[PDB]
RNA sequence: GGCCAGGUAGCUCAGUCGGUAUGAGCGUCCGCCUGAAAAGCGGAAGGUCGGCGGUUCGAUCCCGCCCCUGG
């Protein structure tokens, strides 16, 4: 879309007009183009060939019958008195055609040495070469046929083809549309090398043709954005004429195939000057030519014979009968030039770049004319390109240039296409670059690119040329001076940054969380934001589940995965399947990333004027139109949690390991969490816990549902955990511990509760009743023997009592233990073990 | 399934009607299996809802409690404050010369 | 993502970048293609001067192969102050490259285009322990903040100037360590993360 | 430039040890009264070469610390004596180690900057002050609970603390049996990075524990962080999309052969096809032989460009068995 | 946008233009074996042949539409 192919010989020729004898190596030229801001994607030299590679003429053709494909035994005239007998499998040539022959002893590109062979019962004293075999073009179907008059038989093939040339593959930035021609690139090289430049579109190089009257009646609708529309006819062209070899070759090296002279002229002038041209068969035009917007439901058939559904924003060229062209994109098949065309009407127009860009993108037609118009084409060279086309086409096709010319330039007619002048201080490029440029550097460089510079004290007044509409502000003028002087002259100075505050509390908490999980045996992954296809259906979620309210992507990489992630688990479970399915069956993955949870249907905010700062009310409006993106931490586990070794066979992953991951994230976040049983897919309803920080729910953890594991192809007993980090308040506790120098009292309490009673609820009740004397409590026994009734369990806690100012007695600790036993009896129905 | 592959050895004029009998038997056993799969799956899903309940509050940390010293933590926080302002951390020996 | 960063409407400077748009069509909501919208968000909220970096996920419609990934991470740089110049941008890029490629890291800036910078440039690097031979490889884009961007945030371009840069973390990790397949950097196989150690 | 590589490493060592169940303490530089006499060190022990304080707070404790262990063991005694019997402490601080008698340097004119020769002469007159990391353990390593009765502290826990420090320092370490007081000669390991000795670890001597009043089975660690070089490795792994081949091999060696030496010999012989090797069985008995042991290793083979046959993996396994035969005298179990 | 070639077991891949993919290598499982393993020998399991429809008594195979990859 932004490519620019051109051979160095053509580029050197245009530069050499103003700088005679200018010549550089392809390596140096690539460095210069890069130094001024032209990305060189490729540098491909032609050939190389060695030995006898000569131009020949097919004087006879014998069809060798009795094979798979048509095999031809050809008598080729290579310039001497002995015709060579060549065997060839191509069928794209006839008797009398000029071809390129590689004789025995030649070496084609690729190290292929040519010699005589015994092919198809006959001898092959060489071969007829194709464009691909000579490293000239991409054509490999048939052999290369030079146009008649390209050379005489016996001429050096490398010279006629110009195989010492080098084609340059450029990637032009969208701000330098003027560089999509030999004219612009040569002008850039003249600036970089401080050369005198002769504009190939100037009136000296393209002298104006006579203007004796209108060429064709034309009506232009001005609100279509057209800035110029010129027409000039060329009558009596020879239908049998073809373009010379130098023209067809330069088109080939630029990536354009030659068809007929009329079209070859327009494509050649487009490459030379940057102004797209089109040739209409004037004998097929019926009545007044009209430039207007397309109507609703209107269609048109282009050069390729494809019907195009047009939009009311598309600009058209029409006559009384049909549409003639999709403005700035492609002409129509009604006025196209074919074999019997004798009178042509050349069209030189300047279209609105936005209108062409919209139309070409809707119709998917990025033609050579479209990509140039959408990047603005110089409107001051329209007649010059028109006259260059007429004179060159009449010269090749043996026609006559009509002295008529229609040139619509707007209402009123515009005779000055200069952008508005720009005022800028003479030292502004020096301040932005931090470089003291020599006296007059700014004014010198700005005149080089073609601008008019006047001096008003210390302030310059710069009027950019018509082919540089990208120069609208002093910053644009600064880039011109800086890039031509070379960015390498800018020194390296560290900025005066002020004292910062460093990482935030949330940024530091994430570091601690990832460090703790990795140190605890977890492996970090990067979760993809695109959800898997139908994952929530595999999870068995309700149709109104909050996780299903997703944001969709219009153009995803995979059409079956457009929705964004409302939870980090599907991405982690997908990475877990990858590891398990490749030999790593004992895995523990974790991820820290944001999720996308819309709060409403997707709504957009209109364009706010950029010319000013948006007020805080509109900022709050743009933020409210965005889905909530909270920070989440999640992890999944499968297989062995503890690896096997000399100690034992290892421990498989269980739900308690997911709960331990919660306690690790809690400890890394300096908060206290409580775990309460909950039912929440895709977890096992009997092995699932809802995590709470105080009274706020922050996530879930435990073992996944066995049906979800089956439907998702996960390993058996896979556990998961997910927490909302933004739901956890950032805490910075300042503890003030006072160590007691007095001994402690150790006691164990055994309580019998129902099986459904959580063990933490028993410890919370024992702690609440014991009082301040309780220093530490730890559960170390859960007994469910036959002495304990059914659906009941015995829990034994290790209590440690210590006073801050005295030594306790056993009755002192037993008093707090009894009060703790009474509290457990009231809160969890505990019974002292008997 | 062995009756399905035995149709390839049958004469062409017989595979039509003999095959029609095979699919009818094939769909008969398949339709009975599909419903039984759903009923047994529904029973499994209903079993985990009323049983298999664990105490999610049981202690899970088998690693003892560890802690860095608060003085080292304060020095760490003081260092991060000055690094964020561009300063660096210098060092010096505890046993010092009287010259220094 | 586009309008506040001087992206022209209906122009190849905006249409060339194929972006993930949020359904329905013409919703003006999209997945970010660069960490550059954080420039706008920072300039409206914070008081001048501003010296911030931003690290986050960015989304492009590129197919995942050995050297490209549709979802990658980028580090954004924004410095807005009184009297900032290209030399201050060059000084920041040199210090950044010296910390991630060693003391033998010397950079090279060449002109380029970005809708939000004028002048714009691309940064190349060169360190001594080059995995693929000592040569110039592309690192990221940079340049001075366009005055239109400063006007769209309420900053006077006559008093305040600023520069910027943006480099991909996924691209930086490749040629620094010599990683062969970028797919292994994102696919999440433990065989890729484990050789790097625990990390802290 | 932020933190130096060493300073960053010291934070990682402190974080990793704390997350693994260790509690940081601040060690006092003044040695307990006759601690080395309680350790039973020889009179020519390099640790006995201490720098003495002229005016100490305690007249019986005037020597400065050549090792961090006496201060950590003293803090370990305080915790156990106050009801905290299951305790794991650690400390990161510098020690002092003179290479000669305390030599002073005369006054240098303050009216000017001393030259670099005078600065180097002032630094040479000071004792060597390298930074050490050390840890002590006693009682239960794993606390009891609903899972089981817990595991007491053993020498392998001290060796694991070394590996925790090594993983934090991004370096590889090798353990070799050594006799070095106050460690138990049969439960002591000398830590090496490359070819540089960096410290010792393991269970303490029973006589040292008895004379110092320490808990039975006390284990300790001490490393010289200045002896460990800083490293910033740049790995570039390539994940092979081809399936792996699992194989196990049992090898019989002498009892004194360390299991790591057999694993290294298997790695050296298996070649680049070996992706992972893990030891999961140590067996002894009359089927094996006296003063011998059988070690079984789980091997994982994988090629980066092809699927392997079982003969492909068995060839690399046989080359590993042959490498262990030449290196540690291993015999394939039959 | 073109006519094509591809999507096949857990991994990497053969193979079929109507009734069995007598699928391979590695992966999983069983037996002999070992204190417990692995190899070896001897054996099983596992694919709804990319998805949705259609044609057909019956579709990996024939038709249509769609998803994903290379030219
Ligand atoms: N994210 C990003 C990419 C390219 C930039 C170019 C110039 C300034 C800032 C940029 N940011
Ligand atoms: Mg510019
Ligand atoms: Mg496959």
Tab-separated table of N, CA, C and O in Angstrom, chain D residues 9 166 169-176 190-199 224-231:
chain	number	residue	atom	x	y	z
D	9	UNK	N	20.673	-8.573	44.888
D	9	UNK	CA	20.767	-9.975	45.279
D	9	UNK	C	20.485	-10.156	46.765
D	9	UNK	O	19.855	-11.141	47.167
D	166	UNK	N	21.159	-20.102	46.717
D	166	UNK	CA	21.760	-20.220	45.392
D	166	UNK	C	20.766	-19.858	44.296
D	166	UNK	O	21.133	-19.213	43.307
D	169	UNK	N	20.532	-16.189	44.190
D	169	UNK	CA	21.734	-15.603	43.610
D	169	UNK	C	21.933	-15.976	42.147
D	169	UNK	O	22.896	-15.503	41.534
D	170	UNK	N	21.054	-16.808	41.582
D	170	UNK	CA	21.124	-17.207	40.173
D	170	UNK	C	22.452	-17.890	39.848
D	170	UNK	O	23.030	-17.687	38.779
D	171	UNK	N	22.943	-18.706	40.782
D	171	UNK	CA	24.182	-19.449	40.599
D	171	UNK	C	23.938	-20.910	40.948
D	171	UNK	O	22.992	-21.259	41.657
D	172	UNK	N	24.812	-21.768	40.431
D	172	UNK	CA	24.783	-23.193	40.725
D	172	UNK	C	25.789	-23.509	41.822
D	172	UNK	O	26.888	-22.949	41.851
D	173	UNK	N	25.406	-24.407	42.727
D	173	UNK	CA	26.263	-24.802	43.835
D	173	UNK	C	26.418	-26.315	43.831
D	173	UNK	O	25.551	-27.049	43.345
D	174	UNK	N	27.543	-26.775	44.370
D	174	UNK	CA	27.808	-28.192	44.565
D	174	UNK	C	28.149	-28.428	46.027
D	174	UNK	O	28.895	-27.652	46.631
D	175	UNK	N	27.596	-29.495	46.593
D	175	UNK	CA	27.846	-29.867	47.976
D	175	UNK	C	28.782	-31.065	48.021
D	175	UNK	O	28.632	-32.013	47.244
D	176	UNK	N	29.758	-31.012	48.928
D	176	UNK	CA	30.722	-32.082	49.106
D	176	UNK	C	30.892	-32.334	50.598
D	176	UNK	O	30.927	-31.379	51.388
D	190	UNK	N	30.404	-28.826	52.468
D	190	UNK	CA	31.091	-27.610	52.056
D	190	UNK	C	30.499	-27.146	50.732
D	190	UNK	O	30.494	-27.900	49.752
D	191	UNK	N	29.995	-25.918	50.707
D	191	UNK	CA	29.335	-25.388	49.519
D	191	UNK	C	30.384	-24.820	48.574
D	191	UNK	O	31.296	-24.099	48.996
D	192	UNK	N	30.256	-25.147	47.291
D	192	UNK	CA	31.161	-24.673	46.255
D	192	UNK	C	30.354	-24.055	45.124
D	192	UNK	O	29.339	-24.614	44.700
D	193	UNK	N	30.807	-22.904	44.637
D	193	UNK	CA	30.337	-22.349	43.372
D	193	UNK	C	31.504	-22.418	42.394
D	193	UNK	O	32.600	-21.916	42.680
D	194	UNK	N	31.284	-23.080	41.261
D	194	UNK	CA	32.375	-23.389	40.359
D	194	UNK	C	33.459	-24.191	41.051
D	194	UNK	O	33.289	-25.386	41.311
D	195	UNK	N	34.575	-23.536	41.371
D	195	UNK	CA	35.659	-24.158	42.120
D	195	UNK	C	36.016	-23.375	43.377
D	195	UNK	O	37.064	-23.637	43.980
D	196	UNK	N	35.176	-22.429	43.789
D	196	UNK	CA	35.450	-21.575	44.938
D	196	UNK	C	34.596	-22.023	46.118
D	196	UNK	O	33.369	-22.107	46.007
D	197	UNK	N	35.248	-22.309	47.242
D	197	UNK	CA	34.526	-22.636	48.465
D	197	UNK	C	33.855	-21.385	49.015
D	197	UNK	O	34.477	-20.322	49.102
D	198	UNK	N	32.582	-21.508	49.386
D	198	UNK	CA	31.799	-20.362	49.835
D	198	UNK	C	31.212	-20.540	51.226
D	198	UNK	O	30.611	-19.589	51.748
D	199	UNK	N	31.354	-21.700	51.848
D	199	UNK	CA	30.871	-21.889	53.199
D	199	UNK	C	30.529	-23.342	53.461
D	199	UNK	O	30.801	-24.223	52.652
D	224	UNK	N	29.643	-17.067	52.320
D	224	UNK	CA	30.331	-15.804	52.062
D	224	UNK	C	29.782	-15.243	50.755
D	224	UNK	O	30.150	-15.699	49.669
D	225	UNK	N	28.896	-14.250	50.865
D	225	UNK	CA	28.268	-13.683	49.676
D	225	UNK	C	29.286	-13.011	48.767
D	225	UNK	O	29.100	-12.977	47.544
D	226	UNK	N	30.366	-12.471	49.337
D	226	UNK	CA	31.413	-11.875	48.518
D	226	UNK	C	32.190	-12.921	47.730
D	226	UNK	O	32.800	-12.583	46.710
D	227	UNK	N	32.181	-14.178	48.177
D	227	UNK	CA	32.825	-15.249	47.430
D	227	UNK	C	31.969	-15.755	46.278
D	227	UNK	O	32.494	-16.414	45.375
D	228	UNK	N	30.672	-15.463	46.288
D	228	UNK	CA	29.767	-15.866	45.217
D	228	UNK	C	29.758	-14.756	44.170
D	228	UNK	O	29.396	-13.615	44.500
D	229	UNK	N	30.139	-15.034	42.927
D	229	UNK	CA	30.126	-13.989	41.901
D	229	UNK	C	28.715	-13.686	41.421
D	229	UNK	O	27.837	-14.550	41.392
D	230	UNK	N	28.510	-12.427	41.045
D	230	UNK	CA	27.229	-12.016	40.494
D	230	UNK	C	27.077	-12.535	39.069
D	230	UNK	O	28.052	-12.665	38.323
D	231	UNK	N	25.837	-12.837	38.694
D	231	UNK	CA	25.562	-13.396	37.379
D	231	UNK	C	24.226	-12.875	36.875
D	231	UNK	O	23.271	-12.739	37.645
